[PDB]
Amino acid sequence: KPHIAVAISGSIYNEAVIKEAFHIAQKEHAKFTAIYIDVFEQYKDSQKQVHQHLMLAKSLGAKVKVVYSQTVALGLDEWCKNQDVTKLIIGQHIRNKRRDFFNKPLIDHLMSFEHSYKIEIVPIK
Ligand SMILES: Nc1ncnc2c1ncn2[C@@H]1O[C@@H]2COP(=O)(O)O[C@H]3[C@@H](O)[C@H](n4cnc5c(N)ncnc54)O[C@@H]3COP(=O)(O)O[C@H]2[C@H]1O
């Protein structure tokens, strides 16, 4: 039942995460999905990057999905649980100035959510 999802964002780093996610799904003969959580609440004019990253993953054999949610973490966690993801592939958070609650690393919320799927963090090359 191997379902591997790559978590899409508009960061420049996400493209490398897509390619590594492709290698992991291939080397594991897994079903390959790309999930972007659209949240209105910033990163001015990254809608083109997302668009690009989603197409890249489509061109690598992934089914792409867009989910609208209040939060990145809620969207991803609910979506992974409903689609029976077995591993979610995400990029490395790098700390910046904003140390408020919704600028915490995505992984802190998934951990607090007691994620039931594996999570693979891909660092920057
Ligand atoms: N559009 C953007 N432009 C510039 N910088 C951005 C950005 N979106 C996020 N970043 C920041 O840089 C890090 C890049 O994480 P990456 O996208 O490679 O890997 C991301 C991504 O795989 C996933 N993810 C992040 N946002 C997502 C979203 N809206 N929907 C689905 N997956 C998301 O979480 C991983 C770690 O996210 P985290 O927020 O903790 O860390 C993110 C964030 O601190």
Numbering used by the authors: 236 to 276, 280 to 363
Recite the paper's sentences.
Here, we resolved a 2.3 Å crystal structure of the S. aureus KdpD-USP domain (USPSa) complexed with c-di-AMP. The c-di-AMP binding region in the USPSa was found to involve β1, α1, the β1-α1 loop, β2, the β2-α2 loop, β4, and the β4-α4 loop. One of the two AMP moieties of the c-di-AMP in the USPSa:c-di-AMP structure occupies a pocket similar to the ATP-binding pocket in the USPFG subfamily of proteins, which we refer to as the “inner AMP” (see the Experimental procedures section). The c-di-AMP in the USPSa:c-di-AMP structure adopts a V-shaped conformation with a C6-C6 distance of 8.3 Å. Similar to USPATP proteins, the side chains of the first two β2 stretch residues in USPSa (Ile270 and Tyr271) are able to form hydrophobic contacts with the inner adenine ring of c-di-AMP, and the main chain carboxyl and amino groups of the third residue (Ile272) form hydrogen bonds with adenine N6 and N1, respectively. While the absence of a Walker A motif in the β4-α4 loop of USPSa could alone accomplish the ATP-binding loss, this loop was found to adopt a conformation that is structurally distinct from its conformation in standalone USPFG proteins.
The KdpDE two-component system regulates potassium homeostasis and virulence in various bacterial species.
